[PDB]
């Protein structure tokens, strides 16, 4: 359905381009940034040169009372750290001219869609998210926004395919939007503020729920493993580990060597700015580094074969086990890397719920990595029961992980 | 109008880039600023901080008894393995502070 697009912005050969049939002109400011690793990820900062201005052809400039339209984009919004971020709505995508049109704005814990007709009547729908939560689905993580407008019924906002808010807009006269869309932090009093955005689209219809989920799913890049923030999972990058069965725990190592084990330990600590945020600490426990064994670009893809290093006292060790342990659960150890010898250490990454499949060197499954409780110690294990359960589509517990790298949009000390 | 409020704007005594272990006792500290201060293995016995600022400090392996922070401000500060419950912080403010392993 990315075919209906009257405007589709993507990166290409050191440039932004509109792939639609109207080849809109795109003026890029002097302080606009892109992710060297996922070049479609664009960062805008709180300066007047961090601008992307799209000039629409007159054929598609919106000037109607009735025409339906939608837009969609991915956005990553850093946590709000200070009281200066309160009651300071700032525009980020502006298509308003002479006080009519549309815009996307942000505020503390909010995404806002605004429609304004040429009598200056207004309707807003808003997505609100809390910063007073242990682990947030939204803070500083890529989310999919979609807003649909049916001029005879309702304006609607979806987050990750899911309807959040809807408001009647039939009270609204003619809307004459600008012929420029300005991507820019506008009116934002926090100088360190930034946003990241990718795959902006406009459509001249009201997308239905099915088309919205289809966009959500295909733009997910389903064969590339993602870290916690939604970025591409990367080799040679340290990651704090989160186990989704119980995210209030982190990974620790009791001792190095084949006698030691890794395990899950809680509770997590806390990060706090009084009245602004209170979350769980994510930079806790022993970090994992993914190391190559198998498409040469440093991105981790579904079914790649990797080794996992574990970081203990800022020294790298190898995740490994001997499958000859009695029991299906094979406890995992952090080994000195030269001394690993013949022990099982090759891991098949997978993106859809169990993430790491340990194999021996003959290509045989030792099992997905999760945990087992021995005398109230949640030891990490490789276990083929997980693999058998995913076949039965049976319930698994503990084989689902998130990799959390350090990230400036989260802001926790080091 | 014409008659304005008389408020002292007095700069704080600044101490920075230090480590403290001594289990200091029976003290009052007012108008102090501690920047990049490390309090490692410290027993606060009957100590209180009034209108003081801590920036980029670490409290680690700390215990406290009859010890309070009144109208202090903590910024970029880590409390690791301490016994600091909220009631010990009266009219205080935290900005980007971390708590771990709170006993």
Numbering used by the authors:
A (entry chain A): 873 to 1166, 1169 to 1225, 1233 to 1295
B (entry chain B): 464 to 566
Task: Reproduce the article's own wording on this structure.
Botulinum neurotoxins (BoNTs) comprise a family of seven serologically distinct neurotoxin types, designated BoNT/A through BoNT/G, that cause botulism, a rare but potentially fatal paralytic disease, in vertebrates. BoNT molecules are synthesized as single polypeptide chains that are processed into mature toxins by cleavage into two subunits, a 50 kDa light chain (LC) and a 100 kDa heavy chain (HC), that remain connected through a disulfide bond. The HC consists of a 50 kDa N-terminal translocation domain (HN) and a C-terminal receptor-binding domain (HC) of similar size. BoNT/A, BoNT/D, BoNT/E and BoNT/F bind synaptic vesicle protein 2 (SV2)16.
In order to understand how BoNT/A2 can compensate for the missing interactions seen in the BoNT/A1-HC-SV2C-LD complex structure, we determined the crystal structure of SV2C-LD bound to BoNT/A2-HC. As in the previous BoNT/A1-HC – SV2C-LD structures, the quadrilateral β-helix structure formed by SV2C-LD binds to a two-stranded, antiparallel β-sheet on the convex side of BoNT/A2HC. In the extended β-sheet, the interaction is dominated by backbone-to-backbone interactions. BoNT subtype A2 contains a Glu at position 1156 and a Ser at position 1294 and can neither form a cation-π interaction, nor contribute to an overall positive net charge of the receptor binding domain. The structure of the BoNT/A2-HC complex provides an explanation why human SV2C-LD can still bind strongly to toxin subtype A2 despite the pronounced sequence differences in key residues to the A1 subtype. Specific interactions compensate for the lacking cation-π stacking. SV2C-LD His 564 NE2 forms a salt bridge with BoNT/A2-HC Glu 1156 OE2 and a hydrogen bond with BoNT/A2-HC Tyr 1122 OH. Furthermore, Glu 1156 of the toxin engages in an anion- π stacking interaction to Phe 563 of SV2C-LD. In BoNT/A2-HC, residue 1294 is a serine, which does not engage in polar contacts with the receptor. In the BoNT/A2-HC – human SV2C-LD structure, the polypeptide chain in this region forms a long extension that makes a crystal contact with a symmetry-related BoNT molecule.
